Amino acid sequence: GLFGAIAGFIEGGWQGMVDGWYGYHHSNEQGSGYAADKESTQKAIDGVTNKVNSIIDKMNTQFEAVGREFNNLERRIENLNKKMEDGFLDVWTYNAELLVLMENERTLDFHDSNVKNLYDKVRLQLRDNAKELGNGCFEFYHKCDNECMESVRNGTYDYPQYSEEARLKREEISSG
Amino acid sequence: NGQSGRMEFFWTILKPNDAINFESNGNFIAPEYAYKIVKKGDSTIMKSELEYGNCN
Ligand SMILES: *[C@@H]1O[C@H](CO)[C@@H](O[C@@H]2O[C@H](CO)[C@@H](O)[C@H](O)[C@H]2NC(C)=O)[C@H](O)[C@H]1NC(C)=O
Numbered sequence: 001g002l003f004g005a006i007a008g009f010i011e012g013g014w015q016g017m018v019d020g021w022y023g024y025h026h027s028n029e030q031g032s033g034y035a036a037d038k039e040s041t042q043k044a045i046d047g048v049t050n051k052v053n054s055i056i057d058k059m060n061t062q063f064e065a066v067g068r069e070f071n072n073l074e075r076r077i078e079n080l081n082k083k084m085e086d087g088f089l090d091v092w093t094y095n096a097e098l099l100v101l102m103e104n105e106r107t108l109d110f111h112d113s114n115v116k117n118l119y120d121k122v123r124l125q126l127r128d129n130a131k132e133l134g135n136g137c138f139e140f141y142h143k144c145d146n147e148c149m150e151s152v153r154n155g156t157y158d159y160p161q162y163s164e165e166a167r168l169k170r171e172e173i174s175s176g
Numbered sequence: 177n178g179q180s181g182r183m184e185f186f187w188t189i190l191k192p193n194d195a196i197n198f199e200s201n202g203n204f205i206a207p208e209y210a211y212k213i214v215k216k217g218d219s220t221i222m223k224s225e226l227e228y229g230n231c232n
Pocket residue numbers: 147150151154156
């Protein structure tokens with residue numbers, strides 16, 4: 001997409017995550033599993049719901065056609081009435097199709113933005129304490145248990161707490 | 177319909193406490209039955225070939 005997260009550096013989606021639109025997959029000594037950010041999913045759901053509501057009943061009064069009849073010697077006004085009603089119907093049909101097409105583009109890019117924003121949210125929290133693998137995954141330089149995983153997921157990762165342990169591992173890897 | 181003659185019909189709306197007066201000495205198609213507008217509201221004349229379907 002525009003932000004290059006969905007079908008981008010994250011090559012594919014996950015069928016194992018059913019409880020949310022976006023989330024994480026952790027794999028540590030205690031096991032592996034899926035989860036959700038619980039924030040981006042809520043913000044997206046409300047944002048998508050608001051968009052759908054803002055399209056449904058925003059037309060206020062889309063032109064309601066009314067049947068009118070004209071005799072044999074009123075062809076001009078009859079053709080005028082036919083053109084008028086057909087004109088409004090085409091205008092609103094164009095508005096309906098175009099709005100759906102344009103907002104569909106924004107909605108998918110909106111989902112793309114949220115994934116990249118979530119990816120940046122985790123990248124900026126870890127900083128150098130992990131290694132960016134380039135496919136949407138981060139490899140920790142320190143031990144991260146389940147509670148450590150939850151800290152990353154809910155935005156409360158303590159960088160200095162594991163900074164010294166990560167520095168020892170970064171030194172070892174760079175030294176060979 | 178087998179007739180070369182013509183019948184040209186006219187109508188009017190008679191408001192309350194208003195009187196309609198007729199005077200003719202020939203070719204008069206006199207009225208017998210009139211219609212009271214006993215309910216006004218939204219309606220339409222729908223041009224369709226279908227008929228009743230006993231539904232709501
Ligand atoms: C994010 O999740 C963590 C982990 O659940 C929350 O904090 C810790 O929770 C564990 C047990 O659930 C406690 O033993 C710790 O004392 C909690 N505090 C800390 C500082 O680790 C944390 O509170 C969550 N995020 C927010 C904003 O509250």
